[PDB]
Structures are given as structure tokens and as C-alpha cells.
Design a protein around this ligand. Sequence first.
Ligand SMILES: *CC(=O)NCC1CCN(C(=O)C2(Nc3ccc(Cl)cc3)CCNCC2)CC1
Ligand SMILES: *CC(=O)NCC1CCN(C(=O)C2(Nc3ccc(Cl)cc3)CCNCC2)CC1
Ligand SMILES: [Mg+2]
Ligand SMILES: [Mg+2]
Ligand SMILES: [Mg+2]
Ligand SMILES: [Mg+2]
Ligand SMILES: [Mg+2]
Ligand SMILES: [Mg+2]
Lengths: 5, 5, 236, 236
Amino acid sequence: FPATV
Amino acid sequence: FPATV
Amino acid sequence: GAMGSMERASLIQKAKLAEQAERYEDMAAFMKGAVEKGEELSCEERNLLSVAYKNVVGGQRAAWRVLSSIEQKSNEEGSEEKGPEVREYREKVETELQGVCDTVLGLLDSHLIKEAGDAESRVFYLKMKGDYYRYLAEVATGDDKKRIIDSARSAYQEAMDISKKEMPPTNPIRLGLALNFSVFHYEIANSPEEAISLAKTTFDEAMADLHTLSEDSYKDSTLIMQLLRDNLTLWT
Amino acid sequence: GAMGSMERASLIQKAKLAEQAERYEDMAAFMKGAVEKGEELSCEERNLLSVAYKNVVGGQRAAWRVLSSIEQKSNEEGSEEKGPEVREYREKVETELQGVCDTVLGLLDSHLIKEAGDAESRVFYLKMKGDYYRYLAEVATGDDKKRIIDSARSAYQEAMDISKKEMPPTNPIRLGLALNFSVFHYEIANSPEEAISLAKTTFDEAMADLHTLSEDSYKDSTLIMQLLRDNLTLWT
Ligand SMILES: *CC(=O)NCC1CCN(C(=O)C2(Nc3ccc(Cl)cc3)CCNCC2)CC1
Ligand SMILES: *CC(=O)NCC1CCN(C(=O)C2(Nc3ccc(Cl)cc3)CCNCC2)CC1
Ligand SMILES: [Mg+2]
Ligand SMILES: [Mg+2]
Ligand SMILES: [Mg+2]
Ligand SMILES: [Mg+2]
Ligand SMILES: [Mg+2]
Ligand SMILES: [Mg+2]
């Protein structure tokens, strides 16, 4: 999964 | 801490 | 609410303890209580709120994905019928996830967003609104899925418009918003080209403004820039 | 109970799904429901029960230790008074931990132990009884602390007596019991020499019986033997 903050 | 199972 | 009798300052103190103890459900409950006191949140307090719910919903999303994969495998040709239990338990986790998302959205709507006038606070809350509608979208399969997706888009877009007018291109909130909106485009809106364009332009515009920053600000900005690069590497 | 309407087999199926999703509170709730159906548990089902509650109480114990350390630091000379919040939150976590321990002990008493006639089941449950009284002892500070410690000791001792009569020295249940009872001696009963003697004798007697085992049994036994060695290394 892609990075989120 | 010591090992327990 | 069960936190109605506890002082605001004590709820904040306890949220910080809960974080140290990795008790994120408790942390979120404390922060919900603090929001419900009705006063605006400081930067530090907004961060506590976000960390608490990110960790709670993060765990629910990971569990939902495990269960959804088992369920999908059960519906393949040659898979033995095992009854309703996998669907039921995936539904159980899903309903709990939706509940948490609705709780966060409710705090934002009553009344965090409307009282947030400074760009840093308003953008932060609108980003959260987009994020929790995105999590709802991840599990949506019904009549409302398009409206849920559009709610996430609209929140992110309002945050982007403010951020571009009011904050420098290295501002960590601006960067984090763009990171997440780019993921929304890639994963939710079926718009990988938009996702890539947003990540690239955000990275490049940040790079050009790093010269203005202190060492500590540089560290903060470059950490999020690297997340943008990490996603670009995944997608290209 | 909330699981009263769910089939036994469905509760077991869902406990296994919850384990795969790392949803240990759900796993424990499912297994509680399965126990409350009133039928004896198979080996696999006893393992599900134990894994679920071990993981739930393990997380509570880790949080309690973080909070207890902060509290202890607050009571040192020169520490600024910060009010009742650290004690309150440590108490909150402690009460939840005690609740889980009481729930497990209640399942064992009503009626798992009394129906367990085979050595493997009876020893397993009596070990659990010792373990959950040990967790109660870790947080006990009052009039009953000695009786709680003695309850753990008595449960472990009954399990040891059965295990020595009825099981080979390599049996993983016998080994695990001895591992945990040795930790009880070291950490709870202030008896490090007893702890060391038990770990050493258990290791050595197991070593002498490995020749009787298949490859797969050897793997199981030697894994727990290594835990005994790890503790001996910590303590000597
Ligand atoms: C009150 C405020 O200004 N909050 C923004 C902080 C910027 C630095 N920061 C981070 O870099 C991390 N989290 C994060 C969360 C949301 C947004 Cl929009 C950006 C950044 C810290 C944790 N790892 C990821 C970056 C904390 C929030
Ligand atoms: C039903 C039954 O016979 N259960 C015993 C199993 C023996 C193998 N085993 C383990 O080796 C691990 N867990 C464990 C738990 C309790 C006891 Cl008394 C001994 C061993 C598997 C997980 N890591 C530690 C050893 C599973 C239970
Ligand atoms: Mg007040
Ligand atoms: Mg649903
Ligand atoms: Mg644009
Ligand atoms: Mg039935
Ligand atoms: Mg107490
Ligand atoms: Mg002896």
C-alpha cells in the first residue's frame, strides 16, 4: 500500500 | 522480561 | 459522554500517556472527550487527535483487508462452501470501521471545521475529512459509493485550494495533504495519472523552496518529500 | 452472553479468522462464547483460547508496565506534582487487566478444569490458572496479595504433579508449564534459586528423552527447551 500521513 | 508460553 | 466529567487538561494528559502505552483506542476516546469540551484545539492537540484515530482506523483497515482477501478467495471456482461466517465477520469489522469514521467526521462537522479560521488548522481538518471519507470509500459497495468518493474529493480540494494560497510549498501540512490526495486519486478515483502528476509537482515545488528553511524545518519537509518519492517509485 | 446465539462451530471458525486478522479481543470473545456452550474443548480449541487471552492480557501488561514506570518516576524526589492523572490511568488499565484475568479464571472454574480428566487437558488448564493468578499477582498490592500468589503456586503445583506422573519430560505442555512456573518463582515468589533449579532440571531431563522423538516432536520440544536456556542465561 502507498504511504499516507 | 523472561520468556513464558 | 463518558468523558464529560473529566477536565480538558486531564483528557489531554491522559491521551499523551495512552500514546506512550500504545493504547490508541483509549487515546482516541480521550481526544474525543477533549474535542467535545467545545474549545478549539492547539497544533499539538490536533496532532494527538489525528494520531489516535489514524492508529485505530489503520488497524481496522488492515484487518478488513485480511478478511476481504479470505472472502474473495472463498468466492473463486473450486473453493469449498464454508457458510456465512467469513462475510459476517468481515461485515462486523467493516461496521466498526464505519463507526469510527463516522465518529471522526462528526467531530469535524460539530464543530471543528467551522471554528477553524487559520489556514493551518482549517487545512488540517479538511485533510482529515478527506481521509475519513476515503476510508469509507475503501469499503463502500452501494448506492452511495459515488457520493462518498465525491465527499472525500471535495474536502481534499477545499484543503488544497487553501493550502496553495496560504502556505509555502514546503509546509508539512500542505505536503501531507498532497501526499494523501494523490493516494486518493490513485486508489479511489481510478486516476493514476492525476496521482502521479500531483505527487511530482508537489515534490518539485517543495524542492525549490527548501533553501528558505532552517535545519529543523528542512528535516520535517524532506521526510514527507521522501514519502512522495516512495509513492512515485511504486507507481512508475 | 452476546455469543449465545452463535453456533459453536461458527465461533471457532471466527476465532481462527480473528487470529489471522490479529484481532485478539474479538478472538477472545469468540472463544469465551465457545467455552460457554458447555462442551469440552479439543486440543486445537484449547490453543485458540490460550492464544487469544495471552495476546489480550499481554498487551495490557505491557501498557501497565509503561504506566507504572511513569508513576514511579513521578514519586521520586524532585519530580514536579502533575496531579492524579497518571495514577488514575494506571488504575484504569489495571482494572481492565484484572477483569480479563477474572474472566479467564471464571471459564476455568466454570467448568473447564472439573471436566478435564485427561492429563494433557487438565495440566493445560491448571497451567492457565497459575498464569492468570500470576498476572493478578503482578499488580496486587493489598490484603489479598499473599493469597493471590498462593493461588498461582497451588495451581502450578497441581499441574506439575500431574505432568510428572503422566507425561514424558519432552512433552511441550510439561515443558511450558515448567517454564512458566520457573518464571513465577523468579518474578513473583522471590525464589530465584528455585526458578533456576527448575529450569535446569527440566532442560536436562528433556534433553535425555529427545532420542525417543520424531523430527516433528523434536522440533516442538527443542523450541521450548531453548526458552528455558534463554531464561537461564538471563538469570546466571
Ligand atoms: C499542528 C501541526 O502543524 N501539525 C502538523 C505536523 C507536521 C509534522 N508532522 C509530520 O511530519 C508527521 N505527521 C503528519 C501528519 C499530518 C500531516 Cl498533514 C503532515 C504530517 C509525523 C508523523 N509521521 C509522518 C509525518 C506531524 C504533524
Ligand atoms: C492442545 C495442546 O497439546 N497444546 C500444546 C501445544 C504444544 C506446542 N505449542 C507450542 O510449542 C507453543 N505454545 C505453547 C503454549 C502452551 C504450552 Cl503449555 C506449551 C506451548 C506455540 C507458540 N509458541 C510457544 C510454544 C502450542 C501448544
Ligand atoms: Mg474545566
Ligand atoms: Mg457493510
Ligand atoms: Mg490541480
Ligand atoms: Mg448448536
Ligand atoms: Mg487497583
Ligand atoms: Mg520440585
